[PDB]
Structures are given as C-alpha cells and as structure tokens.
C-alpha cells in the first residue's frame, strides 16, 4: 500500500514524575488496541489519575492533553502492589477509547475521545520536529525523573520510619534527619539529578540508627 490511515503522534498517559508513557506509537495503523498494567506511586493510594496525552515529548506537560479521569476505590496497599490495566483502543472512525481497570476488583472507568481531538497537522509537524531537536534533553529529563521518583520514595519511607520511631528517635538524630529531608525535598524540585542523588546520600548517612 502507498496509503495508511494512522494515528500521527504517540498516545499515552502521564506516569509518576510527569513523564509520558506511550501506549500507542506514532504512525500505528488504525484500528488498534494496546494495554499496559501500572501500579500506584505511593503507599495506600486509593485512586489513580489517568491523564491521556498525545505527542512525542518525554516530559508529559510538553504533549497535548486529550482528557483525564480518575479510577478510585483502590484497596489501600503498598506502592507498586495494585494492578491497574490501562487500555487504549482507537476504532476505525479514529475515536479513542481509554479505560482503566483495577485487576483485583474489576472496577473500571473509561472515557471516549473524539477523532478531532488533539493537535492539527501543522502542530503535528512541529511536535515531531521539536521531539527530534530535543532528543538528548528528553533522555536527560527521563533520567532526572527516575532519580526524582527514587528520591520521592525515599522521602516517604523515611518520614514513615520517623513516625514509626516516635519518642524513641534521639533528638539529635531527628534534627539531622529532618534537615536532610527538607534538603532532599528542595533538591527534588530542581533539575540537577546529581544534586538529588547527593541529598539522598546525605539523608542515608544520617539515617543509619533509624534502623
């Protein structure tokens, strides 16, 4: 064939740390369906937000939002334990159906996004050119987010352990750990990966008695 009707840009969802994760690759033929299983970002999370995105950039915010919805009613559990199957299905009329299903209960939520949604042809061309021109900064941002998500998890598990240690954490350890937590929380908002890893290391160093 010399003609294929395709979805012109990648379609996907935002995952932890604000990165786009692709479910349907750009230039996939329609109709098509693909699914992937995700989990929750933090312990005892009772909902997930499904933010649907069109585009080629690794930073979620740089892509075009097509819609968003929550799946709630998730049984409280440690981060990473729930299983939420996200399915994207584009039918022959170019309508995109996106559903999220909790594999434990079968509870499901879905939206339908009309064929005209998203970026127009000129915007599509720009988006592809921008993604090519920014391929390195995008890979760096991916690496940054991997480190941020680790730092964020370490913040949370540390704060939990401080709560589990209560009156028993010597004041001197508590002060040091709180200052290190603040320092890591501040570093996580920046874009310097090594600064975050350093603050995780400093937090680890003041945390040794905390086990």
């Amino acid at each position: 064939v010399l003609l294929l009707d395709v979805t012109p840009l990648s379609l996907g969802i935002e995952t932890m740390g604000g990165v786009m994760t692709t479910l349907i690759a750009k230039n996939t033929t329609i109709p098509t369906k693909h699914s992937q299983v995700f989990s929750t970002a933090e312990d005892n999370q009772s909902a997930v937000t499904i933010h649907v995105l069109q585009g080629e950039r690794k930073r979620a915010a740089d892509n075009k939002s097509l819609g968003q919805f929550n799946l709630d009613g998730i049984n409280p559990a440690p981060r990473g334990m729930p299983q939420i199957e996200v399915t994207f299905d584009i039918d022959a009329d170019g309508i995109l159906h996106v559903s999220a299903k909790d594999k434990n209960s079968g509870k499901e939520q879905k939206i339908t996004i009309k064929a005209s949604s998203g970026l127009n042809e000129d915007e599509i061309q720009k988006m592809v050119r921008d993604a090519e021109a920014n391929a390195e900064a995008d890979r760096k941002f991916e690496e940054l987010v991997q480190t941020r998500n680790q730092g964020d998890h370490l913040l949370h598990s540390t704060r939990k352990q401080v709560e589990e240690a209560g009156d028993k954490l010597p004041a001197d350890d508590k002060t040091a750990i709180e200052s290190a937590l603040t320092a890591l929380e501040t570093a996580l908002k920046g874009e310097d990966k090594a600064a975050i890893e350093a603050k995780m290391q400093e937090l680890a160093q003041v945390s040794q008695k905390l086990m």
């Binding site: 995952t15 932890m16 994760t21 995700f38 970002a41 999370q45 909902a47 997930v48 937000t49 939420i84």
Partner: peptide
C-alpha cells in the same frame, strides 16, 4: 517493575 501513577 511496573510504572506508577499518582492520584
């Protein structure tokens, strides 16, 4: 490991 969602 599976990717994660906030919310």
């Amino acid at each position: 490991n599976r990717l994660m969602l906030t919310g």
